[PDB]
Each structure stands twice: as C-alpha cells, then as structure tokens.
C-alpha cells in the first residue's frame, strides 16, 4: 500500500567519517543520535542496563525502559557480529519517531558495547536500512514497519551526504523516506539492480586507477553502505590499488606524503552502464599540503566474510559525490551527481 508522504531526517555530519540523525524512543521521548545504516538490519540503542564498567556506555545516551509507558518487554538475547566488533544485549519493544513518522518497533537495548570502536563513536546506536533476510534474531526492520502503514509516496529512501564544513550553516546530511530530494541531485538517475533482493549490493564491473592500472577486471561484488565511513576493498585489491596511488600503509589506514595529495590520479567504479569517477579531492583528506605531514586516504581494506563477502563496500565517500536512491520495490539503487 502507497500513500502521499514523504518524511525527511537532518543529518550531522562529523568528520566526514560519521552522518547520524536524531530519533525518539518510548513515552515520553529518550531522543538518540543514530546512523542510518544500509550495511545491518537491526535497530539498537545502549541500554541502562549496560554496566558502566564499559565506558563507551557513561559517554553516550542509554535507553531506561522504567521510564518509558509505551514499552514492551521481550527480553530475548541479541548479538550483533559486525565488521567493526560486537554489540550483545537483549531485545524490547516501543514506540519510535523517526521525521514525524510514529511506528511500534522491537529494536535491541545493548548491554555490551566496546570501547573500541563506541568511544569512538559521536552517535549512540544504529537504525539498519537493511532488508529482513539479514535481520539478526528475525526482526521485523523499521522500513518494512513504515511500509506497512501505507503511508510513504514511495517504496524508496535516499541519502544525501555533504562535505564537512565548520559553518554551523551547513546541512550535514539528509535521508529522504518515501523518495528523494531533487535540491540535492542534478541530472538523472542511473539505477543497478541488486544482485538478489535482502542485501543492498550490486555487480561492479571494474576498478580504474588513473590511465594504467586495473583491478575488479573480471567482475566483483559492491556493498552499498551508508554505515561505512571509508569506500573498502579486500586486503589483496587494496594493496594493489594503493600500490598503484604511491600510499603506504599505518596500523589501520593508508597515508600519502600531503604535497603528494593533489597530484593522485583518479579512481573509477563501473557500476551498471556508467563509470562513476572520484578524484583526489574526493578520497583525500587535505589537512595540509606539507611535505612533512601525512594524509589519510578515505579508503581502506575490509575482509568482508561470505556470504555477503568478498565484497568491496561503497561507504560515505563514494555517497558525498553521488546522492543515493535505495529502491525497495524495484530491487535496485540509483545514483545520481550530489549537489
Ligand atoms: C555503523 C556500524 C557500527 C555498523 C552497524 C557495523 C559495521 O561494521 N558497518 C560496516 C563498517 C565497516 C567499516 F570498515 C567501518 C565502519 C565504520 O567505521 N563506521 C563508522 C560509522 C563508525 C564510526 C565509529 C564507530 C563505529 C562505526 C563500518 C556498518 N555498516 N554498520
Ligand atoms: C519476543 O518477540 C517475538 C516476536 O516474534 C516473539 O516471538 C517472542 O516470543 C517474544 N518473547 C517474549 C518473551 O515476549
């Protein structure tokens, strides 16, 4: 069932590694920041029940279900294994608010929650994007409870990440429920079909570095996730690639000499028909353009298990270039230039 509306969540960005929004949990409302994440399929918040032993639970907000009227109690244990560590708690039931739309959801109320990576971390929890089949503990996904009222113009949602600026000015981010914003992409979308539906990943077709490099040369897989800071590869593409770019690798990214920063050739992903291209602005962090200081790249490798891996994931800086329409009822995402 298809209504007329269409709800729209701002979104913070912080450091151009983090894009989260606010939401509503319970009665009265306990607001949290979250991402709003295509990679996982689960809603989580850090409980008041997680001991202050872990740190990362004194320096973010904690969900007291003692104080909220509307909650139902489940109480089944949660563990969510994620790329980045663990996250363990149990799951509960209540109202949550996400830009005006009000819907009953089971989310999980995280009781351990690691320091590395949560101490890390400027938002709270996570709202996964991700369809049912990859939902840990068969939770039915906040979108597919929103789809349910019949109430969005679109079985669609769409992501729109800006550029970090300082200028308190600045829109951080978007995501558009129910359809997309054209103030924020210009020309048209260029839809890729998913591979099959309950993952929101792609075939890729190949990977251009500048004129004379070439990796993905006989296809690969491309994970679409807004909940990923950095585009990632394999550990055996992305020695090549940053072999190819004069990068040498640290503890856990890549570097380049800063003066060297603006001079690195292009990189391309064919996706679908086109090639999508982002140059050394795009996947640089120019903090400096001495000879004497490093540079990280926003890129880096991720051994992504199956079976959704081996995959290369497109993260937030493949989504600051091009604004990104996730379809549900078509089983495809579009891109489109951001603006
Ligand atoms: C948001 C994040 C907790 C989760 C739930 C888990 C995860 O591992 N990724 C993939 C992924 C893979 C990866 F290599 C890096 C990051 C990542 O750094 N995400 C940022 C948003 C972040 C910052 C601080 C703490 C945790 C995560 C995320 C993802 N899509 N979602
Ligand atoms: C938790 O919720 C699920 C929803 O399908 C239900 O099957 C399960 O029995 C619930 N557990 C309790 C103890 O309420």
């Not at 994620?82 to 959801?105: E, H, M, P």
């Amino acid at each position: 069932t298809l209504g007329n509306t269409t709800s729209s969540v701002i979104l913070t960005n912080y450091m151009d590694t983090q894009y989260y929004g606010e939401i509503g949990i319970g009665t009265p409302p306990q607001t949290f920041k979250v991402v709003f994440d295509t990679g996982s399929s689960n809603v989580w918040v850090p409980s008041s029940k997680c001991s202050r032993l872990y740190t990362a639970c004194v320096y973010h907000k904690l969900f007291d279900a003692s104080d909220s009227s509307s909650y139902k109690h489940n109480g089944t244990e949660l563990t969510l294994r994620y790329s980045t560590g663990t996250v363990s708690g149990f799951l509960s039931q209540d109202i949550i608010t996400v830009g005006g739309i009000t819907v009953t959801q089971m989310f999980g109320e995280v009781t351990e929650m690691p320091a590395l990576p949560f101490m890390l971390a400027e938002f709270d929890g996570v709202v996964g994007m991700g369809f049912i089949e990859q939902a840990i503990g068969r939770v039915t996904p906040i979108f597919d409870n929103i789809i349910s009222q019949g109430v969005l113009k679109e079985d669609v949602f769409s992501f729109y990440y800006n550029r970090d600026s300082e200028n308190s000015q600045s829109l951080g981010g978007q995501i558009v429920l129910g359809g997309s914003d054209p103030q924020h992409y210009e020309g048209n979308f260029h839809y890729i079909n998913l591979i099959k539906t309950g993952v929101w990943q792609i075939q890729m077709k190949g990977v251009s570095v500048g004129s004379s490099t070439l990796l993905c040369e006989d296809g690969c897989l491309a994970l679409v996730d807004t909940g990923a800071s950095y585009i990632s590869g394999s550990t055996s593409s992305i020695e090549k690639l940053m072999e190819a770019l004069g990068a040498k690798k640290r503890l856990f990214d890549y570097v380049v000499k800063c003066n060297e920063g603006p001079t690195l050739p292009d990189i391309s992903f064919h996706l679908g028909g086109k090639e999508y291209t982002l140059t050394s602005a795009d996947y640089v962090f120019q903090e400096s353009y001495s000879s004497k200081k490093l540079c990280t790249l926003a890129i880096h490798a991720m051994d992504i298990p199956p079976p959704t891996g081996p995959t290369w994931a497109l993260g937030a800086t493949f989504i600051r270039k091009f604004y990104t329409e996730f379809d549900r009822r078509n089983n495809r995402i579009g891109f489109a230039l951001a603006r």
